[PDB]
Amino acid sequence: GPGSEDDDIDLFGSDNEEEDKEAAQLREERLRQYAEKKAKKPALVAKSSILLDVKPWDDETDMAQLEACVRSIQLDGLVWGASKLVPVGYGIRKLQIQCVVEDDKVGTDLLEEEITKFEEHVQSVDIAAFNKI
Protein backbone atom coordinates (compact mmCIF):
# COMPACT_ATOMS: atom_id res chain seq x y z
CA GLY A 1 0.00 0.00 0.00
CA PRO A 2 1.18 3.59 0.65
CA GLY A 3 4.74 3.81 1.79
CA SER A 4 7.06 6.62 1.11
CA GLU A 5 4.73 9.28 -0.38
CA ASP A 6 3.36 6.98 -3.08
CA ASP A 7 2.04 3.46 -3.11
CA ASP A 8 2.54 1.79 -6.53
CA ILE A 9 2.67 4.43 -9.28
CA ASP A 10 5.95 5.12 -11.06
CA LEU A 11 6.97 8.72 -10.90
CA PHE A 12 10.61 8.01 -10.21
CA GLY A 13 13.05 6.93 -12.91
CA SER A 14 15.70 6.74 -10.29
CA ASP A 15 14.55 3.23 -9.45
CA ASN A 16 15.13 0.53 -12.07
CA GLU A 17 12.84 -2.09 -10.39
CA GLU A 18 13.58 -5.03 -12.80
CA GLU A 19 11.55 -8.19 -13.08
CA ASP A 20 14.04 -10.80 -12.04
CA LYS A 21 14.25 -13.54 -9.40
CA GLU A 22 17.20 -11.98 -7.65
CA ALA A 23 15.70 -8.53 -8.09
CA ALA A 24 12.51 -9.68 -6.29
CA GLN A 25 14.58 -10.87 -3.33
CA LEU A 26 16.56 -7.62 -3.35
CA ARG A 27 13.31 -5.52 -3.49
CA GLU A 28 12.17 -7.22 -0.32
CA GLU A 29 15.70 -6.83 1.12
CA ARG A 30 15.31 -3.04 0.68
CA LEU A 31 12.18 -3.10 2.87
CA ARG A 32 13.96 -5.30 5.46
CA GLN A 33 16.73 -2.74 5.72
CA TYR A 34 14.26 0.13 6.02
CA ALA A 35 12.28 -1.71 8.71
CA GLU A 36 15.45 -2.58 10.57
CA LYS A 37 17.51 0.60 10.29
CA LYS A 38 14.53 2.90 10.40
CA ALA A 39 10.96 2.68 11.87
CA LYS A 40 12.61 2.53 15.30
CA LYS A 41 10.63 5.19 17.04
CA PRO A 42 11.58 5.95 20.70
CA ALA A 43 8.55 5.52 22.90
CA LEU A 44 7.55 3.41 25.88
CA VAL A 45 9.01 0.24 24.45
CA ALA A 46 9.44 -2.92 26.50
CA LYS A 47 12.94 -3.85 27.55
CA SER A 48 14.67 -6.78 29.07
CA SER A 49 17.92 -6.77 30.96
CA ILE A 50 19.57 -10.13 30.81
CA LEU A 51 22.64 -11.01 32.78
CA LEU A 52 24.65 -13.57 30.90
CA ASP A 53 27.86 -14.92 32.06
CA VAL A 54 30.49 -15.50 29.53
CA LYS A 55 32.66 -18.25 30.81
CA PRO A 56 36.15 -18.74 29.18
CA TRP A 57 37.83 -22.06 28.38
CA ASP A 58 41.04 -21.46 30.33
CA ASP A 59 43.16 -18.64 31.93
CA GLU A 60 44.80 -18.48 28.51
CA THR A 61 41.45 -17.35 27.12
CA ASP A 62 41.40 -13.56 27.42
CA MET A 63 38.52 -12.09 29.48
CA ALA A 64 38.57 -8.78 27.62
CA GLN A 65 38.13 -10.39 24.23
CA LEU A 66 35.19 -12.36 25.76
CA GLU A 67 33.58 -8.99 26.38
CA ALA A 68 34.69 -7.83 22.91
CA CYS A 69 32.85 -10.78 21.30
CA VAL A 70 29.60 -9.79 23.04
CA ARG A 71 30.12 -6.06 22.47
CA SER A 72 30.50 -6.43 18.73
CA ILE A 73 26.88 -7.74 18.33
CA GLN A 74 25.27 -5.03 16.20
CA LEU A 75 21.51 -4.75 16.51
CA ASP A 76 19.50 -1.61 16.93
CA GLY A 77 18.06 -1.82 20.35
CA LEU A 78 20.79 -4.13 21.59
CA VAL A 79 22.41 -2.15 24.36
CA TRP A 80 25.27 -3.19 26.57
CA GLY A 81 25.36 -2.51 30.21
CA ALA A 82 28.04 -2.94 32.81
CA SER A 83 30.16 -6.04 32.88
CA LYS A 84 31.94 -7.51 35.89
CA LEU A 85 34.15 -10.53 36.42
CA VAL A 86 33.04 -13.05 39.00
CA PRO A 87 35.75 -15.54 40.09
CA VAL A 88 34.18 -18.97 40.52
CA GLY A 89 36.56 -21.94 40.30
CA TYR A 90 40.17 -22.83 39.64
CA GLY A 91 41.32 -20.54 36.89
CA ILE A 92 37.91 -19.98 35.54
CA ARG A 93 36.20 -16.76 36.30
CA LYS A 94 33.06 -15.72 34.53
CA LEU A 95 32.33 -12.40 32.90
CA GLN A 96 28.85 -11.19 33.67
CA ILE A 97 27.56 -8.95 30.98
CA GLN A 98 24.36 -7.05 31.26
CA CYS A 99 22.50 -6.64 28.06
CA VAL A 100 19.56 -4.41 27.55
CA VAL A 101 17.35 -5.31 24.67
CA GLU A 102 14.56 -3.32 23.15
CA ASP A 103 11.92 -6.13 23.03
CA ASP A 104 9.99 -4.75 20.09
CA LYS A 105 13.07 -5.09 17.89
CA VAL A 106 15.62 -7.32 19.50
CA GLY A 107 14.71 -10.57 21.07
CA THR A 108 17.14 -12.59 23.17
CA ASP A 109 17.47 -14.79 20.04
CA LEU A 110 20.10 -12.47 18.62
CA LEU A 111 22.25 -12.53 21.72
CA GLU A 112 21.72 -16.24 22.47
CA GLU A 113 22.55 -17.28 18.88
CA GLU A 114 25.55 -14.97 18.52
CA ILE A 115 27.22 -15.69 21.86
CA THR A 116 26.87 -19.44 21.29
CA LYS A 117 28.76 -18.90 18.00
CA PHE A 118 31.34 -17.01 20.07
CA GLU A 119 31.84 -20.35 21.96
CA GLU A 120 34.98 -20.65 19.81
CA HIS A 121 36.37 -18.48 22.70
CA VAL A 122 33.58 -18.99 25.23
CA GLN A 123 33.39 -22.35 27.04
CA SER A 124 29.69 -22.10 27.68
CA VAL A 125 27.23 -19.29 28.04
CA ASP A 126 25.40 -19.37 31.30
CA ILE A 127 22.43 -17.33 32.32
CA ALA A 128 22.94 -15.49 35.56
CA ALA A 129 19.50 -13.88 35.78
CA PHE A 130 16.78 -12.29 33.69
CA ASN A 131 15.33 -8.92 34.66
CA LYS A 132 12.70 -6.73 33.07
CA ILE A 133 13.13 -2.99 32.83
Side-chain angles (χ1 to χ4, degrees), residues 15-97:
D15 195 294
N16 185 32
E17 305 184 301
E18 178 62 88
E19 191 62 274
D20 179 86
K21 295 182 175 299
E22 303 305 284
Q25 295 166 88
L26 296 177
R27 302 293 288 184
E28 183 174 82
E29 186 64 275
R30 297 300 302 166
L31 283 301
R32 303 179 191 156
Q33 294 177 89
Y34 295 132
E36 177 50 75
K37 298 289 110 283
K38 303 185 65 175
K40 53 184 180 66
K41 303 178 183 297
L44 288 69
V45 184
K47 278 175 290 301
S48 303
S49 182
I50 316 79
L51 298 176
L52 296 79
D53 63 88
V54 189
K55 185 171 65 193
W57 286 94
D58 183 80
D59 272 283
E60 179 174 66
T61 313
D62 178 78
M63 299 295 296
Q65 67 90 89
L66 258 59
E67 181 182 273
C69 293
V70 182
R71 288 185 173 165
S72 43
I73 301 175
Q74 184 178 91
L75 277 306
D76 279 275
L78 186 293
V79 177
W80 302 278
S83 43
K84 57 182 294 181
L85 73 171
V86 183
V88 290
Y90 291 109
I92 300 307
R93 305 170 185 94
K94 52 173 62 193
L95 188 288
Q96 180 185 270
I97 178 64

Coordinates of all heavy atoms in Angstrom, one line a residue, residues 15-97:
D15 N 14.6 4.6 -9.9 CA 14.6 3.2 -9.4 C 14.4 2.4 -10.7 O 13.5 2.8 -11.6 CB 13.4 3.0 -8.5 CG 13.4 1.7 -7.8 OD1 13.3 0.6 -8.4 OD2 13.6 1.7 -6.5
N16 N 15.1 1.4 -10.8 CA 15.1 0.5 -12.1 C 14.1 -0.6 -12.0 O 13.6 -1.1 -13.0 CB 16.5 0.0 -12.3 CG 16.7 -0.8 -13.6 OD1 16.0 -0.6 -14.6 ND2 17.6 -1.8 -13.6
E17 N 13.7 -1.0 -10.7 CA 12.8 -2.1 -10.4 C 13.4 -3.4 -10.8 O 14.0 -4.2 -10.0 CB 11.4 -1.9 -10.9 CG 10.8 -0.6 -10.5 CD 9.3 -0.5 -11.0 OE1 9.1 -0.6 -12.2 OE2 8.4 -0.4 -10.1
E18 N 13.2 -3.8 -12.2 CA 13.6 -5.0 -12.8 C 12.6 -6.2 -12.4 O 12.2 -6.3 -11.3 CB 15.1 -5.4 -12.6 CG 15.6 -6.7 -13.1 CD 15.5 -6.7 -14.7 OE1 16.4 -6.3 -15.3 OE2 14.5 -7.2 -15.2
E19 N 12.4 -7.0 -13.3 CA 11.5 -8.2 -13.1 C 12.5 -9.4 -13.2 O 12.7 -10.0 -14.3 CB 10.4 -8.3 -14.1 CG 9.3 -9.3 -13.7 CD 8.7 -9.0 -12.4 OE1 9.2 -9.5 -11.3 OE2 7.6 -8.4 -12.3
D20 N 13.1 -9.7 -12.1 CA 14.0 -10.8 -12.0 C 13.9 -11.5 -10.7 O 13.4 -10.9 -9.7 CB 15.4 -10.2 -12.2 CG 16.6 -11.2 -12.1 OD1 16.9 -11.8 -13.2 OD2 17.1 -11.4 -11.0
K21 N 14.3 -12.8 -10.6 CA 14.2 -13.5 -9.4 C 15.1 -12.9 -8.3 O 14.7 -12.8 -7.1 CB 14.7 -15.0 -9.6 CG 13.7 -15.7 -10.5 CD 14.1 -17.2 -10.7 CE 13.1 -18.0 -11.5 NZ 11.8 -18.0 -10.9
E22 N 16.3 -12.5 -8.6 CA 17.2 -12.0 -7.6 C 16.8 -10.6 -7.3 O 16.8 -10.2 -6.1 CB 18.6 -12.0 -8.1 CG 19.1 -13.4 -8.5 CD 19.0 -14.4 -7.4 OE1 19.8 -14.4 -6.5 OE2 18.1 -15.2 -7.5
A23 N 16.2 -9.9 -8.3 CA 15.7 -8.5 -8.1 C 14.6 -8.6 -7.1 O 14.6 -7.8 -6.2 CB 15.2 -7.9 -9.4
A24 N 13.7 -9.5 -7.2 CA 12.5 -9.7 -6.3 C 13.0 -9.8 -4.8 O 12.4 -9.2 -3.9 CB 11.7 -10.9 -6.7
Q25 N 14.0 -10.7 -4.6 CA 14.6 -10.9 -3.3 C 15.2 -9.6 -2.8 O 15.1 -9.2 -1.6 CB 15.6 -12.0 -3.5 CG 15.0 -13.3 -3.8 CD 16.1 -14.3 -4.2 OE1 16.7 -15.0 -3.4 NE2 16.3 -14.4 -5.5
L26 N 15.9 -8.9 -3.7 CA 16.6 -7.6 -3.3 C 15.6 -6.5 -3.1 O 15.8 -5.6 -2.2 CB 17.6 -7.2 -4.4 CG 18.7 -8.2 -4.7 CD1 19.6 -7.7 -5.8 CD2 19.6 -8.3 -3.4
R27 N 14.4 -6.5 -3.7 CA 13.3 -5.5 -3.5 C 12.9 -5.7 -2.1 O 12.8 -4.7 -1.3 CB 12.1 -5.8 -4.4 CG 12.4 -5.7 -5.9 CD 12.7 -4.4 -6.4 NE 11.6 -3.4 -6.4 CZ 11.6 -2.2 -6.9 NH1 12.8 -1.7 -7.2 NH2 10.5 -1.5 -7.0
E28 N 12.6 -6.9 -1.7 CA 12.2 -7.2 -0.3 C 13.3 -6.9 0.7 O 13.0 -6.4 1.8 CB 11.8 -8.7 -0.3 CG 11.2 -9.2 1.1 CD 10.7 -10.6 1.0 OE1 11.5 -11.5 1.1 OE2 9.5 -10.8 0.8
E29 N 14.5 -7.1 0.3 CA 15.7 -6.8 1.1 C 15.8 -5.3 1.4 O 16.3 -4.9 2.5 CB 17.0 -7.3 0.4 CG 18.3 -7.2 1.3 CD 18.2 -8.1 2.5 OE1 17.7 -7.6 3.6 OE2 18.7 -9.2 2.5
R30 N 15.3 -4.5 0.5 CA 15.3 -3.0 0.7 C 14.4 -2.7 1.8 O 14.8 -2.0 2.8 CB 14.9 -2.3 -0.6 CG 15.8 -2.4 -1.8 CD 17.2 -1.9 -1.5 NE 17.2 -0.5 -1.1 CZ 18.3 0.1 -0.5 NH1 19.4 -0.5 -0.4 NH2 18.2 1.4 -0.1
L31 N 13.2 -3.3 1.8 CA 12.2 -3.1 2.9 C 12.7 -3.6 4.2 O 12.4 -2.9 5.2 CB 10.8 -3.7 2.5 CG 9.9 -3.0 1.5 CD1 9.6 -1.6 2.0 CD2 10.5 -2.9 0.1
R32 N 13.4 -4.7 4.2 CA 14.0 -5.3 5.5 C 14.9 -4.3 6.1 O 14.9 -4.1 7.3 CB 14.7 -6.6 5.2 CG 13.9 -7.7 4.5 CD 14.8 -8.9 4.2 NE 14.2 -9.8 3.3 CZ 14.8 -10.7 2.6 NH1 16.1 -10.8 2.5 NH2 14.1 -11.5 1.8
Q33 N 15.8 -3.7 5.3 CA 16.7 -2.7 5.7 C 16.1 -1.5 6.2 O 16.6 -0.8 7.1 CB 17.8 -2.5 4.6 CG 18.6 -3.7 4.3 CD 19.6 -3.4 3.2 OE1 20.7 -2.9 3.4 NE2 19.2 -3.7 2.0
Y34 N 15.0 -1.1 5.6 CA 14.3 0.1 6.0 C 13.5 -0.1 7.3 O 13.5 0.7 8.2 CB 13.3 0.7 5.0 CG 13.9 1.2 3.7 CD1 13.4 0.8 2.4 CD2 15.0 2.0 3.7 CE1 14.0 1.3 1.3 CE2 15.6 2.5 2.6 CZ 15.1 2.1 1.3 OH 15.7 2.6 0.2
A35 N 13.0 -1.3 7.5 CA 12.3 -1.7 8.7 C 13.2 -1.9 9.9 O 12.9 -1.7 11.0 CB 11.5 -3.0 8.5
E36 N 14.4 -2.3 9.6 CA 15.4 -2.6 10.6 C 16.2 -1.3 11.0 O 16.4 -1.0 12.1 CB 16.4 -3.7 10.1 CG 17.6 -4.1 11.0 CD 17.2 -4.3 12.4 OE1 16.6 -5.4 12.7 OE2 17.4 -3.4 13.2
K37 N 16.7 -0.6 10.0 CA 17.5 0.6 10.3 C 16.7 1.8 10.6 O 17.1 2.7 11.3 CB 18.5 0.9 9.2 CG 19.5 -0.2 8.9 CD 20.6 -0.4 10.1 CE 20.4 -1.7 10.9 NZ 19.3 -1.6 11.9
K38 N 15.5 1.8 10.1 CA 14.5 2.9 10.4 C 13.3 2.3 11.1 O 13.4 1.2 11.6 CB 14.1 3.7 9.1 CG 15.3 4.2 8.3 CD 14.8 5.1 7.1 CE 14.0 6.3 7.6 NZ 13.7 7.2 6.5
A39 N 12.2 3.1 11.2 CA 11.0 2.7 11.9 C 11.1 2.5 13.4 O 10.1 2.2 14.1 CB 10.3 1.4 11.2
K40 N 12.3 2.7 13.9 CA 12.6 2.5 15.3 C 12.3 3.8 16.1 O 13.2 4.6 16.3 CB 14.0 2.0 15.5 CG 15.2 2.8 14.8 CD 16.5 2.1 15.0 CE 17.6 2.9 14.4 NZ 17.9 4.2 15.0
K41 N 11.1 4.0 16.4 CA 10.6 5.2 17.0 C 10.8 5.0 18.6 O 10.3 4.0 19.1 CB 9.2 5.5 16.7 CG 9.0 5.6 15.2 CD 7.5 5.9 14.8 CE 7.2 5.9 13.3 NZ 7.9 7.1 12.7
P42 N 11.5 6.0 19.2 CA 11.6 5.9 20.7 C 10.2 6.3 21.4 O 9.6 7.3 21.1 CB 12.6 7.0 21.0 CG 13.3 7.3 19.7 CD 12.2 7.1 18.7
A43 N 9.8 5.4 22.2 CA 8.6 5.5 22.9 C 8.7 4.6 24.1 O 9.8 4.2 24.5 CB 7.4 5.0 22.0
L44 N 7.5 4.4 24.8 CA 7.6 3.4 25.9 C 7.6 2.0 25.3 O 6.6 1.4 25.0 CB 6.4 3.6 26.8 CG 6.3 4.8 27.8 CD1 6.1 6.1 27.1 CD2 5.3 4.6 28.9
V45 N 8.8 1.5 25.0 CA 9.0 0.2 24.4 C 9.5 -0.7 25.5 O 10.2 -0.3 26.5 CB 10.1 0.3 23.3 CG1 10.2 -1.0 22.6 CG2 9.7 1.4 22.3
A46 N 9.1 -1.9 25.5 CA 9.4 -2.9 26.5 C 10.9 -3.3 26.4 O 11.4 -3.4 25.3 CB 8.6 -4.2 26.4
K47 N 11.5 -3.5 27.5 CA 12.9 -3.8 27.5 C 13.2 -5.0 28.5 O 12.5 -5.1 29.6 CB 13.8 -2.6 27.8 CG 14.1 -1.8 26.6 CD 14.9 -0.5 27.0 CE 14.1 0.5 27.7 NZ 12.9 0.8 26.9
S48 N 14.2 -5.7 28.2 CA 14.7 -6.8 29.1 C 16.2 -6.6 29.4 O 16.9 -6.1 28.5 CB 14.5 -8.1 28.4 OG 13.1 -8.4 28.0
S49 N 16.6 -6.9 30.5 CA 17.9 -6.8 31.0 C 18.4 -8.2 31.4 O 17.9 -8.7 32.4 CB 18.1 -5.8 32.1 OG 19.4 -5.6 32.5
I50 N 19.2 -8.8 30.6 CA 19.6 -10.1 30.8 C 21.0 -10.1 31.2 O 21.9 -9.5 30.6 CB 19.4 -11.1 29.6 CG1 18.1 -10.9 28.8 CG2 19.5 -12.5 30.0 CD1 18.0 -9.7 27.9
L51 N 21.3 -10.9 32.3 CA 22.6 -11.0 32.8 C 23.1 -12.4 32.3 O 22.7 -13.4 32.8 CB 22.7 -10.9 34.3 CG 22.2 -9.6 35.0 CD1 22.2 -9.8 36.5 CD2 23.1 -8.5 34.6
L52 N 24.1 -12.3 31.4 CA 24.7 -13.6 30.9 C 26.1 -13.6 31.4 O 26.7 -12.6 31.5 CB 24.7 -13.7 29.4 CG 23.3 -13.8 28.6 CD1 22.7 -12.4 28.5 CD2 23.5 -14.4 27.3
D53 N 26.5 -14.8 31.7 CA 27.9 -14.9 32.1 C 28.6 -15.7 31.0 O 28.3 -16.8 30.6 CB 28.1 -15.4 33.5 CG 27.6 -16.8 33.8 OD1 28.3 -17.8 33.6 OD2 26.4 -16.9 34.3
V54 N 29.6 -15.0 30.5 CA 30.5 -15.5 29.5 C 31.7 -16.2 30.2 O 32.5 -15.5 30.9 CB 31.0 -14.3 28.7 CG1 31.7 -14.8 27.4 CG2 29.8 -13.4 28.2
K55 N 31.7 -17.5 30.1 CA 32.7 -18.2 30.8 C 33.7 -18.7 29.8 O 33.4 -19.3 28.8 CB 31.9 -19.4 31.4 CG 32.8 -20.3 32.3 CD 31.9 -21.3 33.0 CE 31.2 -22.3 32.1 NZ 30.1 -23.0 32.7
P56 N 35.0 -18.4 30.1 CA 36.1 -18.7 29.2 C 36.5 -20.2 29.3 O 36.0 -20.9 30.2 CB 37.3 -17.9 29.7 CG 37.0 -17.7 31.1 CD 35.5 -17.6 31.3
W57 N 37.4 -20.7 28.4 CA 37.8 -22.1 28.4 C 38.9 -22.3 29.4 O 38.9 -23.2 30.2 CB 38.3 -22.5 27.0 CG 37.2 -22.8 26.0 CD1 36.7 -21.9 25.1 CD2 36.5 -24.0 25.8 NE1 35.7 -22.5 24.3 CE2 35.6 -23.8 24.8 CE3 36.6 -25.3 26.4 CZ2 34.7 -24.8 24.3 CZ3 35.7 -26.3 26.0 CH2 34.8 -26.0 25.0
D58 N 39.9 -21.4 29.4 CA 41.0 -21.5 30.3 C 41.5 -20.1 30.7 O 41.0 -19.1 30.2 CB 42.2 -22.2 29.6 CG 43.4 -22.5 30.4 OD1 43.4 -23.5 31.2 OD2 44.4 -21.8 30.3
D59 N 42.5 -19.9 31.6 CA 43.2 -18.6 31.9 C 43.8 -18.0 30.7 O 43.9 -16.8 30.6 CB 44.3 -18.8 33.0 CG 43.9 -18.7 34.4 OD1 43.7 -17.6 34.9 OD2 43.9 -19.7 35.1
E60 N 44.2 -18.9 29.8 CA 44.8 -18.5 28.5 C 43.8 -17.7 27.7 O 44.1 -16.8 26.9 CB 45.4 -19.7 27.8 CG 46.0 -19.4 26.4 CD 46.7 -20.6 25.8 OE1 46.0 -21.5 25.5 OE2 47.9 -20.6 25.7
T61 N 42.5 -18.0 27.8 CA 41.4 -17.3 27.1 C 41.3 -15.9 27.7 O 41.2 -15.8 29.0 CB 40.1 -18.1 27.3 OG1 40.3 -19.5 27.1 CG2 39.1 -17.6 26.4
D62 N 41.4 -14.9 26.9 CA 41.4 -13.6 27.4 C 40.0 -13.1 27.7 O 39.1 -13.1 26.9 CB 42.1 -12.6 26.5 CG 42.1 -11.2 26.9 OD1 42.9 -10.8 27.8 OD2 41.3 -10.4 26.4
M63 N 39.8 -12.6 29.0 CA 38.5 -12.1 29.5 C 38.0 -10.9 28.7 O 36.8 -10.7 28.5 CB 38.6 -11.7 31.0 CG 39.0 -12.9 31.9 SD 37.8 -14.2 31.9 CE 36.4 -13.4 32.7
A64 N 38.9 -10.0 28.3 CA 38.6 -8.8 27.6 C 38.0 -9.1 26.2 O 37.1 -8.4 25.8 CB 39.8 -7.8 27.6
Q65 N 38.6 -10.0 25.5 CA 38.1 -10.4 24.2 C 36.8 -11.1 24.3 O 36.0 -11.2 23.4 CB 39.2 -11.1 23.3 CG 39.7 -12.5 23.8 CD 38.9 -13.6 23.2 OE1 39.2 -14.1 22.1 NE2 37.9 -14.0 23.9
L66 N 36.5 -11.7 25.5 CA 35.2 -12.4 25.8 C 34.1 -11.3 25.7 O 33.1 -11.4 25.1 CB 35.2 -13.0 27.2 CG 35.3 -14.5 27.3 CD1 36.6 -15.0 26.7 CD2 35.2 -15.0 28.7
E67 N 34.4 -10.2 26.3 CA 33.6 -9.0 26.4 C 33.5 -8.4 25.0 O 32.4 -8.0 24.6 CB 34.1 -8.0 27.4 CG 33.3 -6.7 27.5 CD 34.0 -5.8 28.5 OE1 33.7 -5.9 29.7 OE2 34.7 -4.9 28.1
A68 N 34.6 -8.3 24.3 CA 34.7 -7.8 22.9 C 33.8 -8.6 22.0 O 33.1 -8.0 21.2 CB 36.1 -7.9 22.4
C69 N 33.7 -9.9 22.1 CA 32.9 -10.8 21.3 C 31.4 -10.4 21.5 O 30.7 -10.2 20.5 CB 33.0 -12.3 21.6 SG 34.7 -13.0 21.2
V70 N 31.0 -10.2 22.7 CA 29.6 -9.8 23.0 C 29.3 -8.3 22.6 O 28.2 -8.0 22.1 CB 29.3 -10.0 24.6 CG1 27.9 -9.6 24.9 CG2 29.6 -11.4 25.0
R71 N 30.3 -7.5 22.8 CA 30.1 -6.1 22.5 C 30.2 -5.7 21.0 O 30.0 -4.6 20.6 CB 30.9 -5.1 23.4 CG 30.4 -5.1 24.8 CD 31.1 -4.1 25.6 NE 30.4 -3.9 26.9 CZ 31.0 -3.3 28.0 NH1 32.2 -2.8 28.0 NH2 30.2 -3.1 29.1
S72 N 30.5 -6.7 20.2 CA 30.5 -6.4 18.7 C 29.2 -6.9 18.0 O 29.1 -6.9 16.8 CB 31.8 -7.0 18.1 OG 32.0 -8.3 18.6
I73 N 28.2 -7.3 18.8 CA 26.9 -7.7 18.3 C 26.1 -6.5 17.9 O 25.6 -5.7 18.8 CB 26.1 -8.6 19.4 CG1 26.9 -9.8 19.8 CG2 24.7 -9.0 18.9 CD1 26.2 -10.7 20.9
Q74 N 25.9 -6.2 16.7 CA 25.3 -5.0 16.2 C 23.8 -5.2 15.8 O 23.5 -5.8 14.8 CB 26.0 -4.4 15.0 CG 25.5 -3.1 14.6 CD 26.3 -2.5 13.5 OE1 26.0 -2.7 12.3 NE2 27.3 -1.7 13.8
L75 N 22.9 -4.8 16.7 CA 21.5 -4.8 16.5 C 21.0 -3.5 17.1 O 21.4 -3.1 18.2 CB 20.8 -5.9 17.2 CG 20.7 -7.3 16.5 CD1 20.1 -7.2 15.1 CD2 22.0 -8.1 16.6
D76 N 20.1 -2.8 16.4 CA 19.5 -1.6 16.9 C 18.5 -2.0 18.0 O 17.6 -2.7 17.8 CB 18.8 -0.8 15.9 CG 19.8 0.1 15.1 OD1 20.1 1.2 15.6 OD2 20.2 -0.3 14.0
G77 N 18.8 -1.5 19.2 CA 18.1 -1.8 20.3 C 18.8 -2.8 21.2 O 18.3 -3.2 22.3
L78 N 20.0 -3.3 20.8 CA 20.8 -4.1 21.6 C 21.8 -3.2 22.3 O 22.7 -2.7 21.6 CB 21.5 -5.2 20.7 CG 22.3 -6.4 21.3 CD1 23.6 -5.9 21.9 CD2 21.5 -7.2 22.3
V79 N 21.6 -3.0 23.5 CA 22.4 -2.1 24.4 C 23.2 -3.0 25.4 O 22.8 -4.0 25.9 CB 21.5 -1.2 25.1 CG1 22.2 -0.2 26.1 CG2 20.6 -0.4 24.1
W80 N 24.4 -2.5 25.6 CA 25.3 -3.2 26.6 C 25.3 -2.4 27.8 O 25.4 -1.2 27.8 CB 26.7 -3.4 26.0 CG 26.8 -4.1 24.8 CD1 26.7 -5.5 24.6 CD2 26.8 -3.6 23.5 NE1 26.8 -5.8 23.3 CE2 26.9 -4.7 22.6 CE3 26.9 -2.3 23.0 CZ2 27.0 -4.5 21.2 CZ3 27.0 -2.1 21.6 CH2 27.0 -3.2 20.7
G81 N 25.2 -3.1 28.9 CA 25.4 -2.5 30.2 C 26.7 -2.9 30.8 O 27.6 -3.3 30.1
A82 N 26.8 -2.7 32.1 CA 28.0 -2.9 32.8 C 28.4 -4.4 32.8 O 27.5 -5.3 32.9 CB 28.0 -2.4 34.2
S83 N 29.7 -4.7 32.8 CA 30.2 -6.0 32.9 C 31.2 -6.2 34.0 O 32.0 -5.3 34.2 CB 30.8 -6.4 31.5 OG 31.5 -5.3 31.1
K84 N 31.1 -7.3 34.8 CA 31.9 -7.5 35.9 C 32.5 -8.9 35.8 O 31.8 -9.8 35.3 CB 31.2 -7.3 37.2 CG 29.9 -8.1 37.3 CD 29.1 -7.9 38.6 CE 29.9 -8.3 39.9 NZ 29.1 -8.0 41.1
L85 N 33.6 -9.2 36.4 CA 34.1 -10.5 36.4 C 33.9 -11.1 37.8 O 34.1 -10.5 38.8 CB 35.7 -10.6 36.1 CG 36.7 -10.1 37.1 CD1 38.1 -10.6 36.6 CD2 36.7 -8.6 37.3
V86 N 33.3 -12.3 37.8 CA 33.0 -13.0 39.0 C 33.9 -14.3 39.0 O 33.7 -15.2 38.2 CB 31.5 -13.5 39.1 CG1 31.2 -14.2 40.4 CG2 30.6 -12.2 38.9
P87 N 34.9 -14.4 39.9 CA 35.8 -15.5 40.1 C 35.0 -16.7 40.7 O 34.3 -16.5 41.8 CB 36.9 -15.1 41.1 CG 36.8 -13.6 41.1 CD 35.3 -13.3 40.8
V88 N 35.0 -17.8 40.1 CA 34.2 -19.0 40.5 C 35.0 -20.2 40.9 O 35.0 -20.6 42.1 CB 33.0 -19.3 39.5 CG1 31.9 -18.3 39.6 CG2 33.5 -19.5 38.1
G89 N 35.8 -20.7 40.0 CA 36.6 -21.9 40.3 C 38.0 -21.8 40.0 O 38.5 -20.6 40.0
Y90 N 38.7 -22.9 39.9 CA 40.2 -22.8 39.6 C 40.5 -22.3 38.2 O 40.2 -23.0 37.3 CB 40.8 -24.2 39.9 CG 40.9 -24.6 41.3 CD1 40.1 -25.6 41.8 CD2 41.7 -24.0 42.2 CE1 40.1 -26.0 43.1 CE2 41.7 -24.3 43.5 CZ 41.0 -25.4 44.0 OH 41.0 -25.7 45.3
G91 N 41.0 -21.1 38.2 CA 41.3 -20.5 36.9 C 40.2 -19.9 36.2 O 40.3 -18.7 35.7
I92 N 39.0 -20.5 36.2 CA 37.9 -20.0 35.5 C 37.1 -19.0 36.4 O 36.7 -19.3 37.5 CB 37.0 -21.1 34.9 CG1 37.9 -21.9 33.9 CG2 35.8 -20.5 34.2 CD1 38.6 -21.0 32.8
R93 N 36.9 -17.9 35.8 CA 36.2 -16.8 36.3 C 35.2 -16.4 35.2 O 35.6 -16.4 34.1 CB 37.2 -15.6 36.6 CG 38.4 -16.1 37.4 CD 39.5 -15.0 37.5 NE 40.6 -15.6 38.3 CZ 41.7 -16.2 37.7 NH1 41.8 -16.3 36.4 NH2 42.6 -16.7 38.5
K94 N 34.1 -16.0 35.5 CA 33.1 -15.7 34.5 C 32.8 -14.2 34.4 O 32.9 -13.5 35.4 CB 31.8 -16.5 34.8 CG 31.2 -16.3 36.2 CD 29.8 -17.0 36.4 CE 29.8 -18.5 36.2 NZ 28.5 -19.0 36.0
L95 N 32.6 -13.8 33.2 CA 32.3 -12.4 32.9 C 30.8 -12.2 32.8 O 30.2 -12.8 31.9 CB 33.1 -12.0 31.6 CG 33.1 -10.5 31.1 CD1 31.8 -10.0 30.6 CD2 33.7 -9.6 32.2
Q96 N 30.3 -11.4 33.7 CA 28.9 -11.2 33.7 C 28.6 -9.9 32.9 O 29.1 -8.9 33.3 CB 28.3 -11.1 35.1 CG 26.8 -10.8 35.2 CD 26.3 -10.6 36.6 OE1 25.9 -11.5 37.3 NE2 26.3 -9.3 37.0
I97 N 27.9 -10.1 31.8 CA 27.6 -8.9 31.0 C 26.1 -8.7 31.0 O 25.2 -9.6 30.9 CB 28.0 -9.2 29.5 CG1 27.6 -8.1 28.5 CG2 27.5 -10.5 29.0 CD1 28.3 -6.7 28.8

